[PDB]
Amino acid sequence: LGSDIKVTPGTSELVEQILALLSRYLSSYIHVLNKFISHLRRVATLRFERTTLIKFVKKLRFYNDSVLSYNASEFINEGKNELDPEADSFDKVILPIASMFVKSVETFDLLNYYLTQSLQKEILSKTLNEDLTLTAESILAIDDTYNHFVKFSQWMIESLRIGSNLLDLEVVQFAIKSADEDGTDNIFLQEILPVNSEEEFQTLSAAWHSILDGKLSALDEEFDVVATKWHDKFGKLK
């Protein structure tokens, strides 16, 4: 399956730019979670929840260290003449990146459920106030960022026809099965156009980059609004 499409000299850099978006998503969570985990050290009833978050933040911080220390040029053979037909195919190069995105996204799905649903309920039940809950707007930003990273990952994979059962995301398959048993259309259900060259992929990546960067900034902003809340409502002295 795939393209026929070969790597160019600009491929290494395109991959670094994609990886950097993932790093920025990971780091944004790691930063807010370090904060939350610090406030929670002072709430005796939330001890075991605090340890579950620590387990998650470690998995994120590991994925982010792995991404940051990955040198993409190390895993790319360009040839030296556009053809060189022992040049790596573009599929061979994107596949591990897409696979890393998928692993991350699935991790975020698990963490997002714990962080925004069950833990939010457990916090309220345990402490009887809203001082350490998330804001509604942070939860929206969380979901909106995830949805876009899901779709971006879907686009990377389907646009090059490198999809397989092993690369399917739970949420995309859920929307497909849900539609086929119901059968303003769902973001994940829309058709992805095959790309016909690297130039076309490059340019769509860049447009995607601009969108995801917008979402990551909105996420960061809401993460600061919530850190400020925790400080004002719990952290600081009375």
């Binding site: 829309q190 156009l193 447009a207 969108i211």
Partner: peptide, 8 residues
């Protein structure tokens, strides 16, 4: 949400 030339 999604840029031109991704979808149809």
């Amino acid at each position: 949400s999604v840029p031109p030339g991704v979808t149809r």
